[PDB]
Amino acid sequence: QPAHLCFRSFVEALKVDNDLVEINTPIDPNLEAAAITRRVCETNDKAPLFNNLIGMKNGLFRILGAPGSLRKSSADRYGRLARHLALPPTASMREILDKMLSASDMPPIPPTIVPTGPCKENSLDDSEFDLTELPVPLIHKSDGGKYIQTYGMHIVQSPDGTWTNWSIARAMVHDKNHLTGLVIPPQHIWQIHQMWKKEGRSDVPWALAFGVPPAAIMASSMPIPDGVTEAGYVGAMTGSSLELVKCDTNDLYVPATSEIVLEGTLSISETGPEGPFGEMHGYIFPGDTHLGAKYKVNRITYRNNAIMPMSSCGRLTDETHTMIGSLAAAEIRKLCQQNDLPITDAFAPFESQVTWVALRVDTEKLRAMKTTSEGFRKRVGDVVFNHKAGYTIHRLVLVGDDIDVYEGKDVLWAFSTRCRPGMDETLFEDVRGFPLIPYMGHGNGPAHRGGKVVSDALMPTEYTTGRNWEAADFNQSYPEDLKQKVLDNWTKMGFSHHHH
Amino acid sequence: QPAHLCFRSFVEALKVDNDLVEINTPIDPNLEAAAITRRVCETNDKAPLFNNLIGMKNGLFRILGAPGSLRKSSADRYGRLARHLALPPTASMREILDKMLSASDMPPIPPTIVPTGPCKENSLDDSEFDLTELPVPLIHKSDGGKYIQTYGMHIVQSPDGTWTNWSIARAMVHDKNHLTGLVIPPQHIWQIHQMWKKEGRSDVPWALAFGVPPAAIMASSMPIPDGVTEAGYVGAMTGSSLELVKCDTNDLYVPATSEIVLEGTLSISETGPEGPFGEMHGYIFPGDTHLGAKYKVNRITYRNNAIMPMSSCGRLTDETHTMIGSLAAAEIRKLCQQNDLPITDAFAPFESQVTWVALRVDTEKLRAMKTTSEGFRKRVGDVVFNHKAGYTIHRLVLVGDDIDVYEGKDVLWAFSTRCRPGMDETLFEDVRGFPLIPYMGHGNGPAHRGGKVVSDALMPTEYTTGRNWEAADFNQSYPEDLKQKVLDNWTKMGFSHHHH
Ligand SMILES: Cc1cc2c3c(c1C)C(C)(C)C[C@H]1C[C@@H](c4ccccc4)[C@]4(C(=O)NC(=O)N=C4N2C[C@H](O)[C@H](O)[C@H](O)COP(=O)(O)O)N31
Ligand SMILES: Cc1cc2c3c(c1C)C(C)(C)C[C@H]1C[C@@H](c4ccccc4)[C@]4(C(=O)NC(=O)N=C4N2C[C@H](O)[C@H](O)[C@H](O)COP(=O)(O)O)N31
Ligand SMILES: [K+]
Ligand SMILES: [K+]
Ligand SMILES: [K+]
Ligand SMILES: [K+]
Ligand SMILES: [Mn+2]
Ligand SMILES: [Mn+2]
């Protein structure tokens, strides 16, 4: 099975790529696995595969850390993401995001039901497992639980059957047969949960599949539109119908090659302690436990020699930056274009802890609009910050065509030099805020509202007659023939490779 | 003579350090020298010494580019600055800035007059030179003149004789015997000029010395207080009285080992076209010529085989970042402490194009103040943005004790995650602004006023009971014994030197 369609194949891909380290000696899921993974993520090292995890019994489970993190080289920086999608490992960020958006004006390719698959190789009933006895990781030393769920996909369906959503949301072990986790607005798992709560008749049928097709986990991390079933979007993106098996204890369908599947219910009434967790913005607030959603597990099915993917998230750079930020940016780019805004590109700079998105403007188009910064900033911020795709993003930075938004150095340069603090900015206090950012949930104002800004790093003549500077850099402040002479004589003179 | 006290010795130091490239084949001062230098600065390469400059005649002149720019290695990143000051080449930024501040509560060591020095080895009168016939560089292709003066020191004295100021301000050739240059408030060359203009009797006696003692050019780039004669401050800093010779045509005194000295007058009446120039923030606005100050040159004296230092300034990283930003930050640190503010450290992040300063707060002291963000932000911004040392800086970022302000990644992390846009900020519109920033002089508001902000990246409990998080990083989210085990087994397991 191809790497983008089968997690087990994905693991082999990483091995083939010389992007894997297999650890075959015993590793403790109490902190040690996650510490090694953290170090990998902070240094862009190879992904770790823990084949001998202390507490693994009856095939549950191995761990793969850092599945969507960065490689050291510039040439294949995003190669792990490219391996989620059948792209060359040198694929650019633009190419990855375009692949992720490609299905947005394609017909869905609905999934194909097959009678069995590897995820049915082993099963444990309601008398045979205990989630407290599995080798679930403690990821950060102050976490409020053992976070089994950092890289699987929750599956929930609307009561009417018309929308089946796939998404990542964290969850931790509560007891032998329950998890607790985040289920918060405006996320689709929350929107669906609310539908079941209003109906009031039953708990939500649920499955949580770990080690799913890599293309599927990418869509699970992207804010594709309300009502859109991720399976059919992934089908369209990959050009193939995904093969799904029915759960044993409910009528939901899981990828046939899922490594581990939990089947059960998401309560419409009960809650339990959840968190704290070392989160995407780089912090944990010890003791900050709050009531979260409560999941009951009725059955576990799994592959022989099952592998659990794990994100050891926190400070730069991990899946919460490479996937949450970039995939929200991609959706925001499309949203802006669908609102007739002249945006060519969007990216969430890593430097911003993925809290900013830089929007590259087609300034030819802007000029034809015959508008001003105040008006344009307002328009852009109303589109983005009133939409779910803008939820996680607190600062938008508008830049002109000379800036490569995928290069954080250049975004920081433009922001710092072209946007006058205050005057060139519009604050948005009456929009949904992202409480996980420390300055929101642990800050001086309302955790859930405001704290957003559009920062205009367009210069005045970019609205009127055209750019009126040249950069004071080697590229722009010297003629072509001179630059090439300099480069051709560089090592001759005594000064100092792309792949590396 | 020691490297910090003699430019010629400094050049040898760089050679000894394996930090110099000597180019002995003909190099054109029309763009080529500056293009090579620009490339050096954008790649942290070795400093170029152009020994065969097309147009050099009778010993005027060789060029040294990138005298205060960065080295590639992390261990000796700031080694060129350390060589200005007799510091080890591995000296940290903190150590360099502390050296630059050390003289601020020392008695001055006034200069020593000596009857001659190398700067008198050759001379040209008022019938023997023509500044249009020297190999003055064209530094950027759209510059409005040939900028002879990018790394020399202007010398001007108050009419009463009590203050002799040394400072860098740019200047370009106007004609055979005049320059034009920037002389703008609140700079000391402007303050002194204004004193002479109010007296109204004569033009200002002036000298411009190139290739001065490196310790002297560092102080020339620092906003030490009004009325303080830089020579005596450098004397105190270095523990030695600087040796100065009298000019031939006026009564000012220049360093005995200056490479090149121009003697003349700074007009109190005349102006001439100046600029545009590829400036520190990374831009040139072609055609943006304005009237600047006008200098008359009456005499040139110079060393045999004179060397002219040159800054090919613009995008990161050159002297306008390493020296302007850092030295303003140092002064701001002291200013804050002298105002009873609990600041331990200050630095202008390169990422900000040196337009921000990050201020590290002793939060134990802050807590004892029993204050709030609004009040504290106001206090800090009133101290800094009403003072000359704050002139160039448009954003101050307050951070707690866990942040190393000399590490721009960490400043960006803290800013992005701990300062709520709007609410956690105070805007300052009625302070002097820095017009050279594009968003000021070429922006939507007054070029000379406002556009400043204090951004509070202190979290709420840093004012009250203490930090209440731990970072989600390898350092903080794992116990010591585990971290050390991970590190000790890192290469054993299969994962991947300080000097490199
Ligand atoms: C890639 C990835 C995404 C995550 C998360 C993680 C990783 C690795 C972990 C490691 C588990 C950390 C936390 C961080 C935490 C978080 C919470 C909200 C927003 C962003 C992050 C959260 C989470 O716990 N809950 C949640 O609601 N959304 C998350 N997303 C974002 C969602 O996958 C993304 O928003 C999708 O678009 C949802 O799908 P939908 O559009 O509703 O169908 N997690
Ligand atoms: C290191 C350095 C400093 C510079 C400059 C340069 C370099 C290399 C060049 C390459 C020439 C580029 C321009 C950029 C330009 C600029 C203008 C104003 C402020 C900052 C930069 C300016 C300049 O042209 N004029 C000016 O007024 N001050 C400058 N400084 C700052 C001053 O040396 C610094 O401010 C000192 O504190 C002054 O001394 P004082 O305290 O008055 O005794 N230049
Ligand atoms: K999704
Ligand atoms: K602007
Ligand atoms: K000075
Ligand atoms: K704050
Ligand atoms: Mn969805
Ligand atoms: Mn001064």
SS3 percent helix, strand, coil of chain A, rounded to 5, is 30, 25, 45
Q: What's chain A's length in residues?
A: 500
How far apart are the C-alpha atoms of A265 and A251, rounded to whole Å? 12
**CA distance linking residue B261 with residue B207, whole number of Å:** 7
Closest by CA position to A337, among listed A303, A372, A374, A383: A383
Which chain B residues are closer than 8 Å to A444 by Cβ? Answer: 373, 420, 423-424, 460
B165 lines ligand 2 (CB under 6 A): yes
Please give the Cα distance from B298 to B129 (Å, whole number): 9
Alpha carbons A67 and A80: distance in angstroms, whole number: 7
Q: Please state, in angstroms and rounded to a whole number, the distance separating the CA atoms of residues B48 and B7.
A: 15
DSSP label at A203? P
* DSSP category for residue A498: -
Return the structure tokens found at A437. 């950012």
Q: How was this structure determined?
A: X-ray
> CB under 8 Å to A410, separation ≥6 — which residues?
A403, A404
Q: How far is CA A389 from CA A335, B59, B173, B310, in A?
A: 8, 66, 55, 49
Here the tokens at position B238 are 């270095």
Structure tokens at A448: 């859930």
Between the CA of residue A397 and those of A343, A345, A361, B437, what are the distances in Å?
12, 12, 10, 18
How far is residue A172's CA from residue B343's CA, in Å, rounded to a whole number?
Answer: 41
* Resolution given for this structure, in angstroms: 1.2
Q: Which residues line ligand 1 (CB under 6 A)?
A: A 150-151, 165, 167-170, 182, 184, 187-189, 221-223, 279-280, 311, 313, 319-320, 323-324, 392, 436
Distance (Å) from the C-alpha of residue A173 to the closest C-alpha of chain B?
A: 20
CA-CA distances (angstroms) from residue B53 to A32, B32, B57, B212, B313? Answer: 61, 10, 9, 21, 20
Q: Is there a contact between A268 and A197 (Cβ–Cβ < 8 Å)?
A: yes
Which one of A167, A184, A310, A334 would you pick to mutate in the ligand 1 pocket, going by the greatest count of ligand atoms within 8 A of its CB?
A167
Task: Kindly determine whether residue B495 and residue A444, on different chains, have CB atoms separated by under 8 Å.
Answer: no
Atom number in ligand 1 closest to CA A230? 43
Give the DSSP letter of residue B224: P
* Rounded Cα distance, A337 and A359, in Å: 11
Q: Ligand 2 atom closest to Cα of B313?
A: 10
Name which of B444, B468, B481, B490 to mutate to probe chain A: the one with the most chain A Cβ atoms within 10 A of its Cβ.
B444
Q: Is A374 a catalytic residue?
A: no
Question: What residues of A are in contact with residue B22 (Cβ under 8 Å)?
Answer: 494
Give the gap in angstroms from C-alpha B239 to the nearest C-alpha of chain A: 36
In chain A, whose CA is at the least distance from the CA of B467? A285
| Residue B315 one-letter amino acid | R
Count CB-CB contacts under 10 A for residue B125. 11
Find, among A284, A138, A168, A162, the residue nearest to A227 by Cα: A162
Q: Which residues of B touch A459 (CB under 8 A)?
A: 438-439, 442-443
- Residue B396 φ/ψ, nearest 5 degrees: -105, 135
Q: How far is B451 from chain A (nearest CA, A)?
A: 5
Nearest CA in chain A to B418: A439
- Pairs of CB atoms within 8 A across A/B: 276
Alpha carbon distances (Å) from A336 to A203, A330, A354, B70, B364: 37, 10, 18, 41, 46
Catalytic residue (choose from B243, B259, B263, B279): B279
Task: Please tell me if residue B420 touches chain A, with a CB cutoff of 8 Å.
Answer: yes
Among A261, A215, A253, A6, CA closest to A120: A261
Ligand nearest to the CA of B181: 2
A120: its two tokens: 């049915």
Q: Is B418 close to A438, i.e. CB distance below 8 A? A: yes
Domain ranges of chain B: 1-330, 331-459, 460-500
Is the distance from CB of A99 to CB of A282 less than 8 angstroms?
Answer: no
- The ligand with the least distance to the CA atom of A216 is 3
